[PDB]
């Protein structure tokens, strides 16, 4: 159920393939939607989740470098997929930028994203 | 125990008083140490902690406005006090800055501070 095209509340697109061995691979596309807004993602997920009605834990990372630009940063999303009627992936994320030693205090941003298979507006 | 003068790894000073009512009141003094870098803090703590060796949970907030300046943000520290020889307060913090809705997604920084009674 994980495999497919997902959208967060801001309109970014998360294209993912969930492998039999627990790998996640795919592409993250920022809201703008152009070639320059595409980035590689990789992660892992629980390929044998519990059958007690719990979600499937997963995580992934995007380094914000592609052939057109480099933001010297990476974001990791940690969350769970919840299947059923309106499937969704609920996450919290950490965005860390490379910084000097003196500026390490503004290195990491924290936030939350909810992904659905329906794109919002 | 909690009441006292504490220092973080970076040179800031946290003067706090823990009241019988679970209140934390005090002053945060930034690394510079001048009048313009003093800010009010308020928070709460578990005034009746477990006696099994567990720490004492607490938290406090500083809004970064004083009579001299305003950084349009506030920081909250969440953590626990661990007493004994080498008393420490271990925390994680969230610093949120006032932003427009478009920039909200980047409004909160996260980090961690350990406080000791020795500078």
């Amino acid at each position: 159920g994980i495999t497919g095209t997902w959208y967060n509340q801001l309109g970014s697109t998360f294209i993912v393939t969930a492998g039999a061995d627990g790998a996640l691979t795919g592409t993250y596309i920022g809201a703008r939607g152009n070639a320059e807004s595409r980035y590689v993602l990789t992660g892992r997920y629980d390929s044998a989740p519990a059958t007690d009605g719990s979600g499937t834990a997963l995580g992934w990372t995007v380094a914000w470098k592609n052939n057109y630009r480099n933001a010297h940063s990476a974001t990791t999303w940690s969350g769970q997929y919840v299947g059923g009627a309106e499937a969704r992936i609920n996450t919290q994320w950490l965005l860390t930028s490379g910084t000097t030693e003196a500026n390490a205090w503004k290195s990491t941003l924290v936030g939350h994203d909810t992904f659905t298979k329906v794109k919002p507006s | 125990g909690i009441t006292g003068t504490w220092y973080n790894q970076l040179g800031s000073t946290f003067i706090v008083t823990a009241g019988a009512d679970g209140a934390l009141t005090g002053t945060y003094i930034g690394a510079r140490g001048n009048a313009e870098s003093r800010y009010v803090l308020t928070g709460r703590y578990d005034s009746a902690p477990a006696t099994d060796g567990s720490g004492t949970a607490l938290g406090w907030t500083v809004a970064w406005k004083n009579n001299y300046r305003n950084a349009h943000s506030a920081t909250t520290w969440s953590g626990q006090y661990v007493g004994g020889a080498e008393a420490r307060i271990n925390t994680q913090w969230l610093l949120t800055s006032g932003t427009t809705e478009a920039n909200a997604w980047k409004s909160t920084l996260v980090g961690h501070d350990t406080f000791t009674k020795v500078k």
Partner: peptide, 5 residues
């Protein structure tokens, strides 16, 4: 302006 947003 970060690409995630």
């Amino acid at each position: 302006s970060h690409p995630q947003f």
